[PDB]
Amino acid sequence: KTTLFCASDAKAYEKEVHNVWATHACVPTDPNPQEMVLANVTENFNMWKNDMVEQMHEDIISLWDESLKPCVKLTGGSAITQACPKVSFDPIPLHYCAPAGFAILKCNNKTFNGTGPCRNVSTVQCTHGIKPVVSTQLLLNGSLAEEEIIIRSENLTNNAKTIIVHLNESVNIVCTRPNNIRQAHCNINESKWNNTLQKVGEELAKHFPSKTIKFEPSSGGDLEITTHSFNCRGEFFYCNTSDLFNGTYRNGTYNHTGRSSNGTITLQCKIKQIINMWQEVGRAIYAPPIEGEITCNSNITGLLLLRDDTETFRPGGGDMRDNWRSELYKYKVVE
Numbered sequence: 001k002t003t004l005f006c007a008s009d010a011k012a013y014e015k016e017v018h019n020v021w022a023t024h025a026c027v028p029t030d031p032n033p034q035e036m037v038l039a040n041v042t043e044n045f046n047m048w049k050n051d052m053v054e055q056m057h058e059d060i061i062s063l064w065d066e067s068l069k070p071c072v073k074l075t076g077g078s079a080i081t082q083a084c085p086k087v088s089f090d091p092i093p094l095h096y097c098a099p100a101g102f103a104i105l106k107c108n109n110k111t112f113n114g115t116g117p118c119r120n121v122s123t124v125q126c127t128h129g130i131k132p133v134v135s136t137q138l139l140l141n142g143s144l145a146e147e148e149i150i151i152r153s154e155n156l157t158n159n160a161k162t163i164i165v166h167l168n169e170s171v172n173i174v175c176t177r178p179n180n181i182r183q184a185h186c187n188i189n190e191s192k193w194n195n196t197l198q199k200v201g202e203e204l205a206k207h208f209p210s211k212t213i214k215f216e217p218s219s220g221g222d223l224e225i226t227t228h229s230f231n232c233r234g235e236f237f238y239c240n241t242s243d244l245f246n247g248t249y250r251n252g253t254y255n256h257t258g259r260s261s262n263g264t265i266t267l268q269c270k271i272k273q274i275i276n277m278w279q280e281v282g283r284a285i286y287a288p289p290i291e292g293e294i295t296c297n298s299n300i301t302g303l304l305l306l307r308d309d310t311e312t313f314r315p316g317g318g319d320m321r322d323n324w325r326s327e328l329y330k331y332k333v334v335e
């Protein structure tokens with residue numbers, strides 16, 4: 001309803017680029033913030049139609065433009081060339097804050113699906129700290145659901161609408177290009193992956209009850225969405241998830257169909273130079289990888305899925321606003 005501002009805990013002596021941008025663009029965080037509970041109120045939220053998502057999307061676009069300059073950017077017919085130095089890149093949390101005379105309602109119902117009415121509501125200056133993690137298929141380094149796994153969708157009946165699965169237990173994923181320069185791999189403990197898909201299948205079954213629930217790799221499209229893609233310490237990883245989204249939940253029980261070894265799933269990854277941009281329809285070209293080991297140790301805290309008797313779910317992604325939605329669902333700007 002108005003224009004927000006950001007508060008961060010950055011330091012202008014980091015030259016990690018999130019820190020630098022935040023020094024330029026955000027104010028320091030209130031050491032101890034104010035919160036106003038109101039369990040009588042009951043307000044309506046709609047995470048799918050939330051202007052904070054647009055504001056934050058704009059901010060992260062600006063952050064990436066200032067911080068991860070491509071050597072070349074192709075947009076339409078145009079090509080733009082600029083210095084593309086390697087940088088230190090580790091996302092920091094950002095808080096979004098209502099300016100004087102507005103507030104941010106937080107919905108405190110732990111099971112709120114992001115849509116409709118919510119009874120226990122709070123007033124706050126700012127959201128919690130949100131790390132702006134750009135990725136597809138898996139949501140990384142978010143904040144887990146407090147009680148049960150939550151299923152969010154603008155419209156579960158419309159299979160074209162992305163499904164956000166909010167996990168209550170995070171699942172470690174470790175990706176590494178060890179010390180072919182482009183080749184890398186991720187490791188997930190097949191045990192926790194097994195459990196979490198069991199319970200995701202349970203919740204999906206509540207929403208589609210007669211059907212058997214299958215998980216399958218992404219059908220088609222750009223590499224950025226047919227693989228789990230993400231930025232790790234500057235470099236763009238594309239990791240194959242076909243041994244990950246590969247299972248069946250039949251009669252209250254989940255069977256994993258992907259292949260594992262010694263009880264870990266290992267995704268083959270490539271580090272790529274030519275990127276399909278998430279900010280706009282366009283391509284972006286970066287320098288070859290730094291040397292040394294490139295490792296990210298991340299928590300999977302959510303999934304992005306798309307639905308095609310049986311119901312079949314595939315990893316989705318590509319519109320980074322959904323990532324922001326997954327974190328901003330509980331908040332509204334008011335007055």
Ligand SMILES: CCCOC(=O)N1c2cc(CNC)ccc2[C@H](NC(=O)C(=O)Nc2ccc(Cl)c(F)c2)[C@H]1CNC(=N)N
Binds near residue numbers: 319
């Ligand atoms: C118009 C602005 C909104 O742009 C979209 O909405 N796009 C969209 C939408 C869908 C439909 N599902 C909602 C599918 C695929 C895409 C595209 N996404 C990506 O290219 C993408 O994510 N690249 C990437 C790069 C680096 C990292 Cl690290 C990463 F993790 C991901 C994108 C369009 N950009 C393009 N065609 N060049």
Ligand SMILES: *[C@@H]1O[C@H](CO)[C@@H](O)[C@H](O)[C@H]1NC(C)=O
Binds near residue numbers: 115152
């Ligand atoms: C979310 O909850 C609302 C009611 O609060 C309901 O109308 C809607 O169908 C639910 N959607 C999902 C995906 O659970």
Ligand SMILES: *[C@@H]1O[C@H](CO)[C@@H](O)[C@H](O)[C@H]1NC(C)=O
Binds near residue numbers: 199
């Ligand atoms: C997480 O939610 C699932 C399904 O909603 C539930 O079965 C499980 O007990 C929960 N686990 C934890 C650790 O809260």
Ligand SMILES: *[C@@H]1O[C@H](CO)[C@@H](O)[C@H](O)[C@H]1NC(C)=O
Binds near residue numbers: 156159
């Ligand atoms: C969502 O699903 C379909 C679209 O295929 C349509 O009935 C309408 O847009 C929505 N229905 C409900 C019940 O929300």
Ligand SMILES: *[C@@H]1O[C@H](CO)[C@@H](O)[C@H](O)[C@H]1NC(C)=O
Binds near residue numbers: 241
């Ligand atoms: C992922 O790997 C499988 C088998 O290894 C292959 O069939 C599939 O095409 C791969 N997908 C991508 C996007 O690389």
Ligand SMILES: *[C@@H]1O[C@H](CO)[C@@H](O)[C@H](O)[C@H]1NC(C)=O
Binds near residue numbers: 217242
């Ligand atoms: C599941 O994994 C196996 C081997 O890891 C592969 O042969 C199979 O094609 C995968 N399932 C799907 C639906 O791709």
Ligand SMILES: *[C@@H]1O[C@H](CO)[C@@H](O)[C@H](O)[C@H]1NC(C)=O
Binds near residue numbers: 195260
């Ligand atoms: C989950 O993974 C563990 C580790 O390999 C395995 O022993 C267990 O049987 C699996 N459960 C399934 C596939 O349902």
Ligand SMILES: *[C@@H]1O[C@H](CO)[C@@H](O)[C@H](O)[C@H]1NC(C)=O
Binds near residue numbers: 090091140231295297
């Ligand atoms: C997730 O957070 C950890 C710790 O901050 C970090 O090492 C890791 O690189 C992060 N993952 C991504 C994809 O940024």
